[PDB]
C-alpha cells in the first residue's frame, strides 16, 4: 500500500479530503492553523496513488504527500 503523510503546513482547507476518490483522507481537529483542522490519512490501505489529493493542495510545496510503495489489488485499482 502507498504511504500518505500530512505536514504541519496544512491550512485545513479540506480540498484534499473532498478530492480523494477512495476515502483515504479525513479532516481531524487541530490547533496549528486558523481553521483548527488538519488532514489525516487513516485509510491508506485504500490509497490508489492517483495523487488527486495533492493536486488540490494550495500550500506552497504541498501539505499532503503520497509516496508510492508496495502494490495491492486495492492500490492497483483492479476490479478483477
Amino acid at each position: 500500500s502507498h504511504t500518505v503523510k500530512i505536514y504541519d503546513t496544512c491550512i485545513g482547507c479540506t480540498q484534499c479530503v473532498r478530492a480523494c476518490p477512495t476515502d483515504v483522507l479525513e479532516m481531524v481537529p487541530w490547533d496549528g492553523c486558523k481553521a483548527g483542522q488538519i488532514a489525516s490519512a487513516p485509510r491508506t490501505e485504500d490509497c490508489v496513488g492517483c495523487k488527486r489529493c495533492e493536486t488540490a493542495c494550495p500550500t506552497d510545496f504541498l501539505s499532503v504527500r503520497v509516496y508510492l510503495g508496495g502494490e495491492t489489488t486495492r492500490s492497483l485499482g483492479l476490479a478483477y
Partner: peptide, 24 residues
Amino acid sequence: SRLIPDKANLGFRFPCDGPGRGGT
C-alpha cells in the same frame, strides 16, 4: 471504466488521473 469510475468528471481532454492504479 473499471479504472476510473468517474472519467466523465475529468472531461474529454485530460492527461491522466495519476501514477496510481499502476499508472493511468
